[model samples]
Target: TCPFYKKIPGTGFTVDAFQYGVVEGCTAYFLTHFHSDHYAGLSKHFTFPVYCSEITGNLLKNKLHVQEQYIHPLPLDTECIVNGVKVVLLDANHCPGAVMILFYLPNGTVILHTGDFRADPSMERSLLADQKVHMLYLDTTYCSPEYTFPSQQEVIRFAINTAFEAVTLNPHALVVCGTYSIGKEKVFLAIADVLGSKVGMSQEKYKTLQCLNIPEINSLITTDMCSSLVHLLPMMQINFKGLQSHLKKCGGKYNQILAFRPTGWTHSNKFTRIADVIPQTKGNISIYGIPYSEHSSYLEMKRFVQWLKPQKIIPTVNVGTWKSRSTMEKYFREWKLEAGY
Candidate 1:
């Protein structure tokens, strides 16, 4: 997940993350989103121009502090030309301003790059109508049956209900939610809205939301945890010391801490070992792992690939990260045979 890129021979334009070698030589660059993994080498020291959606560009400048002159904000569902190549940015559904890029080159070649996106009916219909994409780049983050789980709405319903019930049982209990730096605002916002509480976020999280035009979440963000019962913290900051810091601030007012971690890993068989509702007890904290992922599941990926049917599949995840070529080939063949490909 460091950087996935492709160069068009003598052409200066390149797609997605820009690796820092001659193999990635390019005069123009385009960003899928503001995820740290996708924007590995991008920084304030960079000098090249980057084209991305307006929200993503805002994150780059405000969150990452990159210069505004080098960032180009393109509106979604609009066609734009860069270095003589026709390009369109479509909603990726993974995060705000995240887009699946489609590029049409002068040599009559069509290329599509799925930058960490989940499946959407309208988006698929739009792409399927093209019917001439030659190369495909897949976001195969959860490309295995072990990750089969309920939809985002289903998972969110479960999370919101569970947290609400827990608070109802113990009014003094504090609700601590685990989330990503940028994404997963849906789960956080839903939990807060349904539970009838304003969410407490760090200064950084509030700043990320500040640059965006998202009013639904903007109305829910609060810096004061003492005023709110539900606390929203980044997933990485939900550890013991993190909780201790919160506990020190909150004191004996809260009896127990109800922690909810919304992520795809909860769907993995090895984690649950054996659900629809799996709970793990860590002392007084009852942390619930919910299968709320932004990326498509294995079944969703199969349907996406079968419809596109590009001549080749370039996995966004680097080789050996998930599985070897032989293992991946077996699964691909299995999907093909099952779908009669």
Candidate 2:
């Protein structure tokens, strides 16, 4: 009984693909980004025409090995007609090619799905300010006051500086960074520019970044681990078992290893040793979990809902459903209970 799509009560439209089930039955399907959580059911054999940003569609075609005909590139800020519904893509600022969907239902209701985003001020200047949102599919991933993380830009700066410091402290140390397979390219690119070195990446990470085609990043990529002093190591590899093999490959030559991870989980109340930089005893490794996440913090989410003043708010995160509901309802006075969908 897992839910996939959020259908507007009266409208036959649905946001995001039903990767858990068949997608052809939905009146319309839209992809917010190429993230696995969002694009779960999609594959090269996907039958239905899916809409997303031109860059996202291109990534699906190039990186995910999807066919061209099934991919429909949705233009940002431009109203596109699909299944008799009006839809516009907005920059989500979550990652490269990610977008927020603004759709006007047939009954004159405007709904917005902030598909995994860090709310940007430029979005306020859009029609949402005047037209307003009737239903908001809120991305309440960190919808707890205890989850106060710094802004992405701030974290990016911190991460870049951390890498610089690590490289400076231990000139022979391997400056490794933990990053998601797809996103978090800012740190990698910054490390490359600031250090004046090509960043080493796994083949898998390279494929996704290569598909992005960012001139600055594409030029600074390397699959060879020893090729670069600062390596953008996979988030998974920063762990014990993964590092065992990685360190063995390094041949015990590097005296120290400094690792930095930028994520909101670092500040969550779920743990106590949550500091900006949590140093590990083994391998002289220092992993700094910078507060960098795509979604808004509890305070930011509350502010966003108050600004939009949506009549009804639907939580996007599946885990902690009740927690998000209570948190959002506490902030939005106009909170309308979602009818059984």
List per-prediction Cα lDDT, in the order shown. Answer: 0.75, 0.72
Off by over 4 Å in 2: 1-5, 23-25, 251-253, 268-278, 318-324, 334-341
Give the TM-scores of the predictions, in the order they appear: 0.89, 0.87
Tens digits of per-residue lDDT for model 1 on 1-341?
32444444335765665556333457777788878777767778778878888998898898778898999888777778887777888888897878888878788878888888997666767744765777777787777677676778877778888888888988888989886767877887888888888899788877888776787665788898788888887788677667767777886888788887776666254454213466776667777777777898777888877766676667765456545555666777776667674
User: Could you report the Cα RMSD, in angstroms, for every candidate shown?
Assistant: 2.9, 3.9
Worst 10 residues of 1 by lDDT: 267-276
| 123-142: candidate 2 lDDT, tens digit per residue | 77876676867788878777
Best by lDDT: 1
| CA lDDT, candidate 2, residue 151 | 64
